[PDB]
Write a protein that binds this ligand. Structure first.
Ligand SMILES: [Mg+2]
Length: 307
């Protein structure tokens, strides 16, 4: 019986997203895509701060070796944000690369560093829709040479990413496909190949859409289910195996990250934005942040981007 706790200190988010646990400073970072804000929460000291920008944002990841600098998305730009962690505006922003300069109605969505510190992230139409909408996105990684390489195309809603502990596989979610895919991942060349479905929602009566994901020390995936009011735990040893379900009060669960001193607390973001064709009445759709404990598994600290 896991225990799910609403973090009252944090309030309500329109689309809370992109949780990142920095273990060295025991700090959780996350974003609100639609409200154009970055957020910082220090649980041990009950400290909460935010930063405002004027572009759509989708991730915030500390830069390796540079305290107070972060790699972030600003619409289609990957940028370095210099932020003191407390002032409401950044100190400076420096663009690294625009991934799609000539696709004006796209944006970056989910992004994460692979275990080697390479940033992987995908794009999507700003007006992407569920269950059907424009399909214009692609999946990229950024090299330490500041050039992007494309790995996948025809993505509707570029979402959660994770890598196996032995660095042989990569897991990926296009929410439009309502499944989690697995790929063979070559750490030497950074190539992915042999795409196959790992877990298909329709085969297991799972409502909603997969969104963010993370992996634990046992190699199982924890997947946020947007419009499913839950997180699910799924096997990576065998396809199509649902291991557990944990209900979250907010229906629009968006993403997940392990954190806390012992890396055994699961932080969970959600979205209060009410969409058309929701399966839930508006009084239920709030956008709180949750902490889940007693899962009996640990995960890994967030990886910094090397760049
Ligand atoms: Mg997402």
């Amino acid at each position: 019986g896991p225990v799910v706790e609403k973090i009252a200190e944090l309030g309500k988010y329109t689309v809370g997203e992109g949780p990142h646990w920095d273990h060295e400073t025991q700090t959780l970072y996350f974003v609100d895509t639609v409200e154009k804000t970055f957020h910082k929460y220090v649980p041990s000291q009950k400290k909460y701060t935010f930063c405002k920008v004027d572009k759509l944002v989708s991730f915030i990841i500390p830069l390796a070796g540079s305290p107070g600098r972060f790699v972030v998305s600003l619409e289609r730009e990957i940028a370095i944000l210099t932020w003191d962690g407390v002032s409401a505006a950044p100190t400076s922003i420096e663009a690294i690369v625009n991934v799609e300069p000539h696709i004006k109605n796209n944006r970056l969505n989910d992004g994460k560093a692979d275990p080697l510190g390479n940033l992987w992230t995908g794009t999507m139409a700003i007006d992407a829709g569920l269950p059907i909408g424009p399909v214009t996105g692609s999946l990229y990684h950024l090299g330490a040479d500041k050039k992007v390489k494309m790995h996948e195309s025809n993505i509707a809603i570029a979402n959660g990413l994770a890598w196996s502990n032995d660095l042989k596989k990569m897991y990926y979610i296009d929410s439009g496909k309502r499944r989690v895919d697995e790929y063979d991942y070559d750490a030497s060349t950074l190539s992915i190949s042999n795409q196959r479905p790992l877990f298909t929602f329709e085969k297991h009566e799972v409502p909603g859409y997969p969104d963010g994901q993370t992996i634990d020390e046992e190699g199982n995936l924890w997947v946020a289910v947007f419009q499913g009011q839950r997180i699910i735990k799924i096997s990576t040893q065998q396809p199509e195996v649902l291991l557990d379900t944990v209900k979250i009060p907010d229906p629009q669960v968006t993403s997940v990250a392990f954190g806390g001193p012992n890396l055994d607390e699961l932080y969970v973001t959600s979205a209060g934005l009410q969409l058309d064709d929701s399966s839930f009445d508006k009084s239920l759709v709030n956008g709180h942040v949750y902490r889940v404990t007693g899962l009996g598994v640990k995960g890994f600290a967030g990886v910094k981007v090397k760049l």
